[model samples]
Target: YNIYVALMHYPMRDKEGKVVTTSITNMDLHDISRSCRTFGVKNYFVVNPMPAQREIASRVVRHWIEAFEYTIITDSLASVIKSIEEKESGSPIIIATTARYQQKAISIEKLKEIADRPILLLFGTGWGFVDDILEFADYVLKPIHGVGDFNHLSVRSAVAIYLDRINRSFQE
Candidate 1:
């Protein structure tokens, strides 16, 4: 009955040591949050914008980038799921969109049949969801055409599709 939007923010101290900036894209997150609010699901959704730090640091810029990137993003995602579970209002169901199919056709259909409940839908990054997250998913649903050639999709488009499905499902 509720949806939560979570985004990762990097807590980098400025040279002055008095100001901190984040690498997170607040504008993009706000834009998506606004659209969800307009869809009458505003109160149903909660937005969490949080900071993350790497458990380690590296010399190469590329390595640092990769490490920090995964740390923040995955932390935000896990936080969202944990928040849902802490509510203890209902069971947490994970709906994942990735190339990996977890179940056969019959089993998938059966899973879908009982998925009409509060659920967490995960959209992966370009590198795709981590193996640990996949292990935690209850259902993994992939796009019929492999996310348009390169697993590349703007997050807005993904959110739009999710909102559309929610709207359509309510229309008899």
Candidate 2:
């Protein structure tokens, strides 16, 4: 089974009520890529709409995979897919990770339990994703939890937890 992860979406939020999307930072690009590389991710998508940001992200990935479309960086099984590179990826089963679970949201465990094909795990940055991506996901993952009311984790930490949990059984 192939697995993909995205650390950002096209229209990420600054907060719940805010409708604005967020930009991709270098640390986000660097740390998240390291996590993807560490976890054997087959496709680590950036999924942004901005060209400058897409270019920068592609630059970071180019060091590892060498070459591809100016907006995407690729290798044997994995690549960084931008919103600009919106060609078909064989309609991968897409899942979104959120801090708050929404209506009809599904647990990553259950998804793994039922999934029989390739899967892509999408992460939204800033406050959250815009309505476009919010509804575009096939499933939204339950938030990574903690004992306290404060459950927020950096996207890097979030990816690590999801990667570990989603692939935990498979790794064995």
Candidate 3:
């Protein structure tokens, strides 16, 4: 009955070993880790760092996750998914996005029923979900309604909403 969040490493200096100026930093990570620990949060880890859109989106996702109360566990997608599966809780509900018109709505009832179990929510970098990852997903959910066909929020907001919903469900 715990939650785990995974991501890459905190930004560090090239040579001096100091924290970098990027949005994702050891300081920010520590702050987030501390907050989660304070709240008796579950596991959190970070995986390898990748390079992409460092100018604008480097720390964007990290910041969003940290803003919430969940601690993140960093690991590769395969490894993380494997760990979730090994838990043997009737297959972790993998959450992702889909462009297909047919597959969208996710069953909230099922999600609520397994709230205490492990779940794997996958997101792509800038390119969106990959075919391999998509194949691995147990279910894909999209917004209830398209927002004028263009007014789409970033993946970060979607993740935030997902986490917020989980928190709220427990409260209710």
Which of the numbered candidates is closest to the native, going by highest TM-score? 2
Clashing pairs in 2: 13-127, 13-128
Q: What global local distance difference test value does model 1 have? A: 0.46
TM-score of 3: 0.52
Question: Residue-wise lDDT of candidate 2 within 1-172, one digit each (tens)?
Answer: 7777766645567655566646667677667777776888765666666666677767766664541332232221124433313444455676877787687777766787867767777777787666666587777777887886888888888998888887786754
**1-172: candidate 3 lDDT, tens digit per residue:** 5655444333323244444322334443454455445434454444444444232233544564544424434335566656656655445556655343335346545567755666555443333444444555666655434566663454445445556656666677
The lDDT per prediction is 0.46, 0.66, 0.48
TM-score versus the correct structure, for each prediction: 0.54, 0.78, 0.52
Q: lDDT of candidate 3?
A: 0.48
Enumerate residue pairs that collide in model 3: 5-72, 5-73, 6-73, 44-72, 44-73, 45-72, 45-73, 45-74, 46-74, 47-74
Candidate 1 has its poorest 10 consecutive residues by lDDT at 53-62
C-alpha-based local distance difference test score of model 2? 0.66
Worst 10 residues of 3 by lDDT: 7-16
Residue-level error in angstroms, candidate 2, position 133:
2.6
Off by over 4 Å in 2: 62-89
